Amino acid sequence: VKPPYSYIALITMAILQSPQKKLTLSGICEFISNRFPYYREKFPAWQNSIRHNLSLNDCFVKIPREPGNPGKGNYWTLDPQSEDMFDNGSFLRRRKR
DNA sequence: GCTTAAAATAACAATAC
DNA sequence: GTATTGTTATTTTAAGC
């Protein structure tokens, strides 16, 4: 059902798409599932997968189980670094792996 | 044809409520 | 006690030499 793809890319865009300086792991899961149905169909653990490609890359700060996460109500905050490491490049989705 | 790197995936673990 | 997130580590895939 279609091959896999770079999540970091979708992530970088998920964060970039939000220049408001804010993001939510859950929100992303929705933004992705909303974008890709197949992904929301199989969802072979897009939790760690996303969160992985989400954190493992940008290297930002997130908020764990807070007093305002009834189900999937969390908050993720990223510093002005992701857009920095990106702007520098030119949307390289590999970088001579 | 082989190895190396990075990307992608999965499982657990820790905190918080 | 339960629920949500976070962190780590392992795996797999694909491209680099």
Side-chain angles (χ1 to χ4, degrees):
Chain A
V1 60
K2 255 229 189 206
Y5 240 75
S6 62
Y7 280 28
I8 49 257
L10 279 302
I11 265 67
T12 61
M13 195 194 86
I15 197 77
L16 290 166
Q17 75 96 253
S18 27
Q20 224 96 100
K21 290 257 149 202
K22 248 178 203 128
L23 204 68
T24 57
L25 116 79
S26 296
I28 240 52
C29 175
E30 182 154 323
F31 141 67
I32 295 313
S33 51
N34 185 291
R35 281 285 218 139
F36 306 106
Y38 147 42
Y39 292 178
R40 198 191 115 199
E41 193 263 294
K42 190 96 147 250
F43 209 119
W46 273 61
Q47 179 263 277
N48 334 321
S49 253
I50 297 289
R51 280 186 229 179
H52 166 91
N53 287 260
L54 195 23
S55 86
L56 198 118
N57 245 229
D58 302 42
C59 278
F60 36 53
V61 183
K62 327 127 242 75
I63 71 118
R65 178 72 142 121
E66 253 208 345
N69 321 41
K72 61 222 88 226
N74 49 305
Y75 258 93
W76 278 43
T77 309
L78 153 155
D79 239 34
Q81 234 150 292
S82 164
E83 62 180 71
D84 211 283
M85 63 148 181
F86 236 52
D87 246 18
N88 190 352
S90 60
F91 215 127
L92 258 110
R93 178 219 108 103
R94 229 116 191 70
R95 246 279 186 156
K96 248 133 111 212
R97 197 213 209 91

